[PDB]
Amino acid sequence: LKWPRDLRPLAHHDLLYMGQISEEDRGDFNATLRNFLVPRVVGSQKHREVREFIVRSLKDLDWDVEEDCFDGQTPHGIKPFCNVIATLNPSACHRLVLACHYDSLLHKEGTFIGATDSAVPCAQLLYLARSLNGKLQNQKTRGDGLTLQLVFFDGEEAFERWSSHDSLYGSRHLAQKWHEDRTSAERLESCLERSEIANQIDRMEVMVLLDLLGAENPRFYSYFGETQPVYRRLVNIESRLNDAGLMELPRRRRRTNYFSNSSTVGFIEDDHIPFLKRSVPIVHIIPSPFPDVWHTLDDNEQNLHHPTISNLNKIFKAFVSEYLQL
């Protein structure tokens, strides 16, 4: 069964534009990332500050911003959690959803920054919203029934040993909340003809979850047969950026090969799981293997690889432009 939305190849002109990274682009992304490169454990003041920063940044871009806040039991007692959901056009029936988690692991060995996990993804979502704002605000006025939505999940990380009850607090809560929130096509702007909408979860057209990004030379694979058509667009976009000579490589005539043109057999627990269980199509943009620094005290700012981050930002901008026809 084919993808419900016909995926129009990005024109060469738009590919080139989305693949440009000005020096002020680098500066803007880095200034954004600075805000996330702090310990932000659930319950903490810096966590509150990060949450408010995400909210303010997106309200400042005229997005609808909602918080899904709740208290939940953990192995460390009751904890406050707040998912941040930003929607460009709330009334649009369908959402291309981009997501990540904004809490950082409470590491028993010491202060843990979680630069890849997931400060970089957080900054990338905000950067996309900011760099594309003009084109997104224009796309919003089309009445075409599609919009962009950014979800910054809280409480992805376990407090103690990972378990089904100790992990994914924010994503489990939100998936449940949206599944139970009933709606229908007649309440929404321009749903696709063959759509089945019974609740808010049905409006998530696909969730692209970014996690553990920022380390050198990540390897991605298609984890889900259901989103192979979408995944293949990332593969194709990356290839064309390389053809166009727009990727940053250590030497001339190398190509990036982040998005493997294959699927892998692997089960990764992450914020997509509660949505996957409710039939939300998932593209999981997480490296395999995980970065070497994963859950170590070395997951920090200096171990990020800036050229890779720039290349990923090009791919993501082109992908959003292609999906939303910006």
Select the span of 35-43, 113-121, 144-152, 188-196 touching Mn ion (CB under 5 A).
Answer: 113-121
Residue numbers 192-211 binding Mn ion by CB under 5 A:
none
Task: Return the number of the residue (82 or 105) whose C-beta is nearest Mn ion.
Answer: 105
DSSP 20-74: ---HHHHHHHHHHHHTTSS---TTSHHHHHHHHHHHHHHHTTT-EEEEEEEEE--
* Cis peptide leading into residue 274 (ω within 30°): no
User: Are 100 and 118 within 8 A, CB to CB?
Assistant: yes
Tell whether 157 is in a known binding site: yes
Residue 86: name the closest of 98, 103, 101 by CA: 98
CB-closest chain residue to Mn ion? 117
Q: What angle do CA 173, 174, 176 make, to 5 degrees?
A: 70
Asked whether position 117 contacts Mn ion by CB under 5 A, the answer is yes
Catalytic residue numbers read: 156, 211
Lay out the site mask for Mn ion across 167-186 (x = CB under 5 A, - = otherwise).
Answer: --------------------
Tell whether 117 is in a known binding site: yes
Cα 8 to the center of its chain, rounded Å? 22
Task: Return the number of the residue (117 or 238) whose C-beta is nearest Mn ion.
Answer: 117
**Quick count: other Cβ atoms within 10 Å of Cβ 179?**
19
Quote the least distance from Cβ 22 to Mn ion, whole Å. 32
Select the span of 64-72, 103-111, 232-240, 305-313 touching Mn ion (CB under 5 A).
Answer: 103-111
For residue 147, list its beta bridge partners: 95
Tell whether 295 is in a known binding site: yes
Q: How many residues bind Mn ion (CB under 5 A)?
A: 2
Task: Return the number of the residue (92 or 105) whose C-beta is nearest Mn ion.
Answer: 105
Quote the least distance from Cβ 295 to Mn ion, whole Å. 6
Residues 135-161 as b/e (b if ≥16 CB within 10 A, e otherwise) read: bbeebbeeebbbbbbbbbbbbbbbbee
Distance, in Å, from the CA atom of 37 to the CA atom of 33, rounded to the nearest integer, reads 6
In the DSSP assignment, the letter for residue 225 is G
Task: Return the number of the residue (202 or 270) whose C-beta is nearest Mn ion.
Answer: 270
Distance, in Å, from the CA atom of 147 to the CA atom of 143, rounded to the nearest integer, reads 9
Task: Return the number of the residue (105 or 146) whose C-beta is nearest Mn ion.
Answer: 105
Select the span of 60-68, 99-107, 218-226, 304-312 touching Mn ion (CB under 5 A).
Answer: 99-107
Quote the least distance from Cβ 105 to Mn ion, whole Å. 5
Select the span of 16-24, 112-120, 166-174, 218-226 touching Mn ion (CB under 5 A).
Answer: 112-120
Residues at the contact surface with Mn ion, assessed by CB under 5 A:
105, 117
Binding site residue list for Zn(2+): 117, 157, 295
